[PDB]
Amino acid sequence: GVAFRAPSIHG
Protein backbone atom coordinates (compact mmCIF):
# COMPACT_ATOMS: atom_id res chain seq x y z
CA GLY A 1 0.00 0.00 0.00
CA VAL A 2 1.00 3.66 0.34
CA ALA A 3 1.43 6.15 3.21
CA PHE A 4 2.81 9.36 1.74
CA ARG A 5 0.90 11.37 -0.87
CA ALA A 6 1.69 10.45 -4.48
CA PRO A 7 3.36 13.36 -6.44
CA SER A 8 0.65 15.18 -8.42
CA ILE A 9 -2.52 13.28 -7.42
CA HIS A 10 -3.96 14.35 -10.82
CA GLY A 11 -2.45 11.27 -12.45
GROMACS .gro file of C-alpha atoms in nm:
model
   11
    1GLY     CA    1   0.000   0.000   0.000
    2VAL     CA    2   0.100   0.366   0.034
    3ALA     CA    3   0.143   0.615   0.321
    4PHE     CA    4   0.281   0.936   0.174
    5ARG     CA    5   0.090   1.137  -0.087
    6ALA     CA    6   0.169   1.045  -0.448
    7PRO     CA    7   0.336   1.336  -0.644
    8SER     CA    8   0.065   1.518  -0.842
    9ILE     CA    9  -0.252   1.328  -0.742
   10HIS     CA   10  -0.396   1.435  -1.082
   11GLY     CA   11  -0.245   1.127  -1.245
   0.00000   0.00000   0.00000
